[PDB]
């Protein structure tokens, strides 16, 4: 369970080195740290926070850092990584989450409450962020994407008054209705 992410990562480098583009998805990445923690604790290594070794951070760094966008000189290939993490109580303050978040560029935070409400995919745009941003989007999406983000941003602020739709004055309930469409 500890070698599989590196094993699959090596398979992706083949496409990256040859100029091809590859996508690698590490499912249950958090379990990897548990597997490495198991080997560490059984070896009687000095345990750290949450019994994880001191190099638990380095474990994921050397792995994800191999997924990059090679320049045109090497071939122009690329390797996209999508590690998965399972939060117990949705608290990203734990040891492992803080490590993966500090290493990765952005994180797509999924909420369980939104899934019950019927928002499928249950993507929380509030916490979800992308460092590349519009630089990755195509020229067609950049424009409409900018305005869309602003509309949702204002809607979430007014969402606290959704139940009070008719009570509030005009020009505000309309914004709530518009956000519901988006």
């Amino acid at each position: 369970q500890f070698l599989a992410p590196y094993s699959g990562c090596a398979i992706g480098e083949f496409f990256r080195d040859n100029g091809k583009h590859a996508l690698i998805i590490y499912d249950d990445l958090s379990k990897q740290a548990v597997a490495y923690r198991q080997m560490s604790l059984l070896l009687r290594r000095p345990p750290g926070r949450e019994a994880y070794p001191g190099d638990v951070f380095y474990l994921h760094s050397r792995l994800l850092e191999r997924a990059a966008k090679m320049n045109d000189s090497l071939g122009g290939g690329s390797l996209t990584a999508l590690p998965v993490i399972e939060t117990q109580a949705g608290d990203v303050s734990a040891y492992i989450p803080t490590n993966v978040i500090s290493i990765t560029d952005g994180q797509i935070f999924l909420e369980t409450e939104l899934f019950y409400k019927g928002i499928r995919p249950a993507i929380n745009v509030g916490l979800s962020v992308s460092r590349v941003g519009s630089a990755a989007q195509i020229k067609a999406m950049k424009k409409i994407a900018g305005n869309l983000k602003l509309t949702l941003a204002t809607y979430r602020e007014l969402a606290a008054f959704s139940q009070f739709g008719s009570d509030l004055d005009a020009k505000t309930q309309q914004q709530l209705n518009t956000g519901e469409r988006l």
Partner: peptide, 9 residues
Amino acid sequence: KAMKMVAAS
């Protein structure tokens, strides 16, 4: 906070 908005309206 919401009732305050309605109180003003």
